[PDB]
């Protein structure tokens, strides 16, 4: 087998884990002995993103009441749900509309995972951890633990474990450093941008087969602008936990992968409520959703010209808002580059 460090091999295994993939599919409500995860077409996946949008011209301009439901079963025709039986959410509603635009986000990254594990390995004369790892086009060094740099990480995780969702508690198992090919280069533009940060990205595990081969991405050319709080960028927290709930770690799979990304923020569009932008106005390089908890400015490490806000959860002064923690959003893919991965046990509670 691979000379690959054992944390790496094992990490390959969990992100290329097909069973898992259906697990998540079922967690949306998918009917898999209707539509199986060989069939998941990027084809169908984007044809239904468009159906989510037409339902929001519709619902946001009053509309033919009956068509709203036609658009709804159109949707359901296209993505089989094991409903199974209750009564299905008929898409007159901004709420279940993004409920479903989250699902499709995941089927995207899941199709990238699933289609990925049918390229190269019928081998053998390279082996199975080995083939998956190369098709990541990424290099995954094991960060060495008792060293200062793993400790800054864990200090980050620590101080930014939130003030409210302190039930689970967190714990770090492996610190992977990461290089995807070429994204040093594409990021070069933003290399010297002002105002530049280490922030968090949690995702389900079943997504990181696709985050490693494509980086984080902006949403499809068809995905509702209205499906995302801040329209169609890429999303980051400073608080470890605002991101860490996004992996969807239960008691029956409490291991989570979180990213650390360097992100070229510049001048932040400050915003307390939602804002369905496509478009960032001139003079503005990022958005900042304003939270009532910031990490403590009294603590703000800056290594390599990037800031790192490993600061305990302090009240900002901002009560006026729909967000409890900050978020950051960028509208160009190159405006971020991935630095670390973390393997995390979500250690639940009593």
Task: Enumerate residues 6+ apart whose C-beta is below 8 A from 65.
Answer: none
Range in contact with ligand FRQ (rule: CB under 6 A) among 50-58, 63-71, 147-155, 233-241: 233-241
State the pairing for strand pair 323-325/291-295: parallel
Is 246 one of the binding residues for ligand FRQ (CB under 6 A)? Answer: yes
Is 170 one of the binding residues for ligand FRQ (CB under 6 A)? Answer: no
Closest CA to 256 of 190, 325, 206: 206
**Pair of tokens at residue 266:** 């510049």
CA 180, CA 215: separation in Å to the nearest integer? 8
Q: Which of 203, 226, 249, 294 binds ligand FRQ (CB under 6 A)?
A: 203
Q: Which residue has the tokens 């279940």?
A: 96
What are the b/e assignments for 169-196, b being 16+ CB within 10 Å? ebebebbbbbebeebeebbeebeebeeb
Is 154 one of the binding residues for ligand FRQ (CB under 6 A)? Answer: no
203 assigned binding-site residue:
yes
CA 264, CA 266: separation in Å to the nearest integer? 6
Please state at what angle helix 18-28 crosses helix 94-116, rounded to 10 degrees.
170
Is 113 one of the binding residues for ligand FRQ (CB under 6 A)? Answer: no
Comparing CB distances to ligand FRQ, the nearer of 9 and 293 is 293
Q: Which of 100, 180, 197, 201 binds ligand FRQ (CB under 6 A)?
A: 201
Binding residues among 40-79 for ligand FRQ as defined by CB under 6 A: none
Cα-Cα-Cα-Cα dihedral sign, residues 107, 327, 301, 263: positive
Is 161 one of the binding residues for ligand FRQ (CB under 6 A)? Answer: no
Range in contact with ligand FRQ (rule: CB under 6 A) among 48-56, 105-113, 125-133, 294-302: 105-113
Comparing CB distances to ligand FRQ, the nearer of 29 and 109 is 109
Is 243 one of the binding residues for ligand FRQ (CB under 6 A)? Answer: yes
CA 147 to centroid of chain Cα atoms: 28
CA 61, CA 19: separation in Å to the nearest integer? 41
Concerning whether 222 is annotated as a catalytic residue, the answer is no
Closest CA to 285 of 236, 335, 333: 335
Comparing CB distances to ligand FRQ, the nearer of 130 and 200 is 200
CA 309, CA 205: separation in Å to the nearest integer? 25
Residue 327: phi, psi to the nearest 5?
A: -135, 155
202 assigned binding-site residue:
yes
CB of residue 170 to ligand FRQ, shortest distance in Å: 14
* Interface size with ligand FRQ, residues (CB under 6 A): 17
38 assigned binding-site residue:
no
CB of residue 95 to ligand FRQ, shortest distance in Å: 16
Closest CA to 248 of 34, 93, 87, 26: 26
- Catalytic residue of the set 29, 111, 183, 327: 327
Is 109 one of the binding residues for ligand FRQ (CB under 6 A)? Answer: yes
Q: Which of 157, 269, 327, 330 binds ligand FRQ (CB under 6 A)?
A: 327
Is 202 one of the binding residues for ligand FRQ (CB under 6 A)? Answer: yes
Q: Footprint of ligand FRQ on this chain (CB under 6 A)?
A: 105, 108-109, 200-203, 217, 219, 228, 235-237, 242-243, 246, 327
Active-site amino acid positions: 327
Known binding residues for NAD(+) are: 201-203, 210, 217, 243
């Amino acid at each position: 087998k691979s000379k690959l460090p054992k944390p790496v091999q094992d990490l390959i295994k969990m992100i290329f884990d097909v069973e898992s993939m259906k697990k998540a599919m079922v967690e949306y409500e998918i009917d898999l002995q209707k539509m199986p995860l060989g069939k998941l077409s990027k084809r169908q996946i984007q044809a239904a993103y468009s159906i989510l949008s037409e339902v929001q011209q519709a619902v946001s301009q009053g509309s033919s009441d009956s068509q709203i439901l036609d658009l709804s079963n159109r949707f359901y025709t296209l993505i089989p749900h094991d409903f199974g039986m209750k009564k299905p959410p008929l898409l007159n509603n901004a709420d279940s509309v993004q409920a479903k635009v989250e699902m499709l986000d995941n089927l995207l990254d899941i199709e990238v995972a699933y289609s990925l594990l049918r390229g190269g390995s019928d081998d053998s004369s390279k082996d199975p951890i080995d083939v998956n790892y190369e098709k990541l086009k990424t290099d995954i060094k094991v960060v060495d633990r008792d060293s200062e740099e793993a400790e800054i990480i864990r200090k980050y995780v620590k101080n930014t474990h939130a003030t409210t969702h302190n039930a689970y508690d967190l714990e770090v198992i492996d610190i992977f450093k990461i290089e995807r090919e070429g994204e040093c280069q594409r990021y070069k533009p933003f290399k010297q941008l002002h105002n530049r940060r280490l922030l968090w990205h949690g995702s389900r595990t079943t997504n990181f087969a696709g985050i490693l081969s494509q980086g984080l991405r902006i949403a499809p050319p068809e995905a509702p602008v209205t499906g995302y709080m801040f329209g169609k960028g890429i999303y980051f927290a400073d608080m470890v936990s605002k991101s860490a709930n996004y992996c969807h770690t239960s008691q029956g799979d409490p291991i989570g992968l979180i990213l650390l990304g360097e992100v070229a923020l510049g001048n932040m569009y400050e915003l307390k409520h939602a804002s369905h932008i496509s478009k960032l106005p001139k003079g503005k390089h990022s958005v900042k959703g304003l939270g009532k908890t910031t990490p403590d400015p009294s603590a703000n490490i800056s290594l390599d010209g990037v800031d790192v806000p490993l600061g305990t959860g302090i009240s900002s002064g901002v009560n006026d808002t729909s967000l409890l923690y900050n978020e950051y959003i960028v509208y160009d893919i190159a405006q971020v580059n991935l630095k670390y991965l973390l393997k995390l046990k979500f250690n639940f509670k009593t």
